[PDB]
């Protein structure tokens, strides 16, 4: 706010305006990034008063009405992340609005599965949604219903480990905390550069105007103008490149929102390790957290196997699953869970005589 | 004779309050763990400036002289405690080559269980004094701990200095270097710890 300096800054023309235009382009994009992750749901779906989700317990991830109206795990995440012409603008969506979108996405997912992404939300019982998520990974739905208490207890236990993982240490949130740190470090660096001389007699602008007369002071001030303007161009270039890194992360987060919250991804290791069942979005400062629920197969046995079995000269192949021998009998099992079925013309289909197939075995096929 | 200085000899480098914060600054400081000179007086070089410290609960030491000749041909600082307070003069003193006290002039001014520590430095035309007083439990070496020295006076005398001597049981002398230091300011703006950045790779 020196008027002597302002008259010299006008000689540099459009440099000052295009720094404000560049930072405004970044600032508006941060709301576009936040909108396109969370605002994927057209209606604010809300959970019923009852909580009979087949024994699954979402109480740590659904909203807490006693709390902003964040979930328990969203409150952990919001606790663990922590004027020389510079200003900071508010986001377009408050944390209370972001928590209404994660609540709507979660309440839709729980009460209606993949269906609320594709059209109107269609209700389905949670144990039947999980059966259709099990069929999606090639495990036959009776493997859910016959194990529903075990699967519910394993899910409830695994959400319990998320509370401990986020309560006992902050160190998991390093990706979000580093985004706060890089912006604080960049703003402090931009302000610290006001103390630098850039070769001028002093860095204090009124000090130059006391020590020297107009023509000499103008030569000393033009060093401060050159250095401070080069320090803004350095900061705004650095924020343009850092905004491209955050936009690439926001496009990835918008894609995990669409393909894993609103659906069930078939893409290997995209939405957690193991075969993907579903995921739940939880908000965090400057980011999003997905709790990816996945099936991991856990207790293998070795079996002898054959590509086909030869019956009355005909080679039989399994429709779904694979042949295995327990040691002396032969069975067909689904691929991803040991459930042995007796080999029948329902389980198997024919293709030609034995002699074409390398490694075919002689065993009986039952005809009902 | 010589001694390890430990972490002694930090002072407030400017009249600025800072709090709850770490400040990185370059100034004439005594290096940490420097191997400083020790005495029970000789004329000494002044270099960039001096840290001077004494086991003073005794009034053996009375004052100092600073200049180039320390004799007649040019003006020199004389500093003496008159047993009430410090007196300062800058006269062309022709005084004794072995000065002692019982166990023209262009400027003038008037202000064992203990250590009294002082820093003397000259910049562009001002002579600056910083000091501190503390209890101690050791007779031989400097007390191994930390406490910063506070400014007393900042004198507009314009004199050139290259040598000094004491007027007058242990006391110690060490020379400032243009070190970079990191300074820990507490809630009341006292320096409560420091790192000599050039000391070792962890300090860097």
């Amino acid at each position: 706010d020196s008027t002597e300096c302002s008259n010299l800054l006008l000689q540099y023309g459009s440099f000052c305006t295009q720094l404000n235009r560049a930072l405004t382009g970044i600032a508006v994009e941060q709301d576009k990034n936040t909108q396109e992750v969370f605002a994927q749901v057209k209606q604010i779906y809300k959970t019923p008063p009852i909580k009979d989700f087949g024994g699954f317990n979402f109480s740590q991830i659904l909203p807490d009405p006693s709390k902003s109206k964040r979930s328990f795990i969203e409150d952990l995440l919001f606790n663990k992340v922590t004027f020389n012409g510079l200003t900071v603008l508010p986001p377009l969506l408050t944390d209370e609005m972001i928590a209404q979108y994660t609540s709507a996405l979660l309440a839709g997912t729980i009460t209606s599965g993949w269906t609320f992404g594709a059209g109107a939300a269609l209700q389905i019982p949670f144990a039947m949604q999980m059966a259709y998520r099990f069929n999606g990974i090639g495990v036959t739905q009776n493997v859910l219903y016959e194990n529903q208490k075990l699967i519910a207890n394993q899910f409830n236990s695994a959400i319990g480990k998320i509370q401990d993982s986020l309560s006992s240490t902050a160190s998991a949130l390093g990706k979000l905390q580093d985004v706060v740190n890089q912006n604080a470090q960049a703003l402090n660096t931009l302000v610290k550069q006001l103390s630098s001389n850039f070769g001028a007699i002093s860095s204090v602008l009124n000090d130059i105007l006391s020590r020297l007369d107009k023509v000499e002071a103008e030569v000393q001030i033009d060093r401060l103008i050159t250095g401070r303007l080069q320090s803004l161009q350095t900061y705004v270039t650095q924020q343009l490149i850092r905004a491209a890194e955050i936009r690439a992360s926001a496009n990835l987060a918008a894609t995990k929102m669409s393909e894993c919250v609103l659906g069930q991804s078939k893409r290997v290791d995209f939405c957690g390790k193991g075969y993907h069942l579903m995921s739940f979005p939880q908000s965090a400062p400057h980011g999003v957290v997905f709790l990816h629920v996945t099936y991991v197969p856990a207790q293998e046995k070795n079996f002898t196997t054959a590509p086909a079995i030869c019956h009355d000269g005909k080679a039989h192949f399994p429709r779904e699953g694979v042949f295995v021998s327990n040691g002396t009998h032969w069975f067909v099992t689904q691929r991803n869970f040991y459930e042995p079925q007796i080999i029948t013309t329902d389980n198997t289909f024919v293709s030609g005589n034995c002699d074409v197939v390398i490694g075919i075995v002689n065993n009986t096929v039952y005809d009902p | 004779a010589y001694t390890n200085s430990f972490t002694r000899g930090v002072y407030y480098p400017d009249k600025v309050f800072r709090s709850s914060v770490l400040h990185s600054t370059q100034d004439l400081f005594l290096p940490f763990f420097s191997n400083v000179t020790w005495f029970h007086n000789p004329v000494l070089p002044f270099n960039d400036g001096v840290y001077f410290a004494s086991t003073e609960k005794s009034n053996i030491i009375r004052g100092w002289i600073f200049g180039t000749t320390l004799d007649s041909k040019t003006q020199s600082l004389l500093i003496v405690n008159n047993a009430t307070n410090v007196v300062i003069k800058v006269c062309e003193f022709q005084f004794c080559n072995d000065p002692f006290l019982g166990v023209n002039c262009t400027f003038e001014y008037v202000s064992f269980k203990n250590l009294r520590e002082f820093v003397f430095k000259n910049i562009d035309g001002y002579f600056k004094i910083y000091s501190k007083h503390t209890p101690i439990n050791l007779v031989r070496g400097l007390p191994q701990g930390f406490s910063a020295l506070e400014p007393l006076v900042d004198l507009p005398i314009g004199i050139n200095i290259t040598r000094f001597q004491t007027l007058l049981a242990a006391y110690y002398v060490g020379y400032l270097q243009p070190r970079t230091f990191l300074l820990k300011y507490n809630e009341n703006g006292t320096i409560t710890d420091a790192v000599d950045c050039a000391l070792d790779p962890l300090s860097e």
Partner: protein, 414 residues
């Protein structure tokens, strides 16, 4: 807005046109209590005085020289100054000042000037052509003149050569005034080099005695031990002001504060070097400094082809510092706050948006996220679609920029 966009038509949006900044209500100056006023009484008011052949110099240093005490003293028979106007003296600073003092007759006071000639000028006290400093005199016939004549005062009548500028020579050696060799004793044309004015009370205005003082100034590598007195104003808290404390010039709002500076500390700094507190030099309170209130000014507008009404957002400002409404984004002016919620038309921030709506005005509202829906969940109900719609969705993606190439030589140096 039209000027900030450099165009005559403005389309719908929010445009940052300008920056609001509270102006300083007044300018304030603070310095320590004015002390060590220079010892001019020892030269201007002392009872004793010097003979002009052997003048007395007082060295002036380490003090504030209020020259207005001298030049406003209407009792003085003359004031003159060289290289400086009297009203400018109290702004200046010097390494040393010298006050040179003597008694002379009134008719020789006119000799006391740069480069002039006469008995005093050439043989008692010589001033250079480039003398910078002041000449001051007053009649002293009350002290320096006596019945029968005061013969105690003397001036040099004879010398072999003129004095150089500020040369001092008190010697009484007998002077050869002609062909007579002196041989260490007086005689015809071998004379005592001094004479007396003999000041009698019957003397006229030009023969009466005057006490004279000449002030000489210098600036060197040693710092300025003399300055004219520093002014100061009253202190204003809670208003926006421009301020100086000693040499710490700035603009801000001043308040009392909970900060406890150590006794020697004068200023306080924030994490990023920015000054945020000061000690007042006349009563040692610690004042917080905060910047005078500022923020981006944004014009919210419908398209100018539809309406010329506008609303203004003062980003981060609180309205008491500028319909009117305090949003979390800042003071919003010229927009009706509305109790409904709608899809976001023009965004403002912190959940607020604005639009031009019904007879029409700019409204501002908390944006609506979407229609609330209770999914009809129960543990044995399923909804199955009985029918479908084929939907066609248009998606647009950019694929390439306009290819440009610049001749760097022709752009820089046509």
């Amino acid at each position: 807005t039209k000027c900030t966009l450099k165009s005559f038509t403005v389309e719908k949006g929010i445009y940052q046109t300008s920056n609001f900044r509270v102006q300083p209500t007044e300018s304030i100056v603070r310095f320590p209590n004015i002390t060590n006023l220079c010892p001019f009484g020892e030269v201007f008011n002392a009872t004793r005085f010097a003979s002009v052949y052997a003048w007395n110099r007082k060295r002036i240093s380490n003090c504030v020289a209020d020259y207005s005490v001298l030049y406003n003293s209407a009792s003085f028979s003359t004031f003159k100054c060289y290289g400086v106007s009297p009203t400018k003296l109290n702004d200046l600073c010097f390494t040393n000042v010298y006050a040179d003092s003597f008694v002379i007759r009134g008719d020789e006071v006119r000799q006391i000037a740069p480069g002039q000639t006469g008995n005093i000028a050439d043989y008692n006290y010589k001033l250079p052509d480039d003398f910078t400093g002041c000449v001051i005199a007053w009649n002293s016939n009350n002290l320096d003149s006596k019945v029968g004549g005061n013969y105690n005062y003397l001036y040099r009548l004879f010398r072999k050569s003129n004095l150089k500028p500020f040369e001092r020579d008190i010697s009484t050696e007998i002077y050869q005034a002609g062909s007579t060799p002196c041989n260490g004793v007086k005689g015809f044309n071998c004379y005592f080099p001094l004479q007396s004015y003999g000041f009698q009370p019957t003397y006229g205005v030009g023969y009466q005695p005057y006490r004279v003082v000449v002030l000489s100034f210098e600036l060197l590598h040693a710092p300025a031990t003399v300055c004219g007195p520093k002014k100061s104003t009253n202190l204003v808290k809670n208003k926006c002001v421009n301020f100086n404390f000693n040499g710490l010039t700035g603009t801000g709002v001043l308040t009392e504060s909970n900060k406890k500076f150590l006794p020697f500390q004068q200023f306080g700094r924030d994490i990023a070097d920015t000054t945020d507190a000061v000690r007042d030099p006349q009563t040692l309170e610690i004042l917080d400094i905060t910047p005078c209130s500022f923020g981006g000014v944004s014009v919210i507008t419908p398209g100018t082809n539809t309406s010329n009404q506008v609303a203004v957002l003062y980003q981060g400002v609180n309205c008491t510092e500028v319909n009117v409404f305090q949003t979390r984004a800042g003071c919003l002016i010229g927009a009706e706050h509305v109790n409904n919620s709608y899809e976001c038309d023009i965004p403002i921030g912190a959940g607020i948006c604005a639009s031009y709506q019904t007879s029409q005005s700019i409204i501002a509202y908390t944006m609506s996220l979407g229609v609330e829906n209770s999914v009809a969940y129960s543990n044995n109900s399923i909804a199955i679609p009985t029918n479908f719609t084929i939907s066609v969705t248009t998606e647009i993606l950019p694929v390439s920029m306009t290819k440009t190439s610049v001749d760097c030589t022709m752009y820089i140096c046509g």
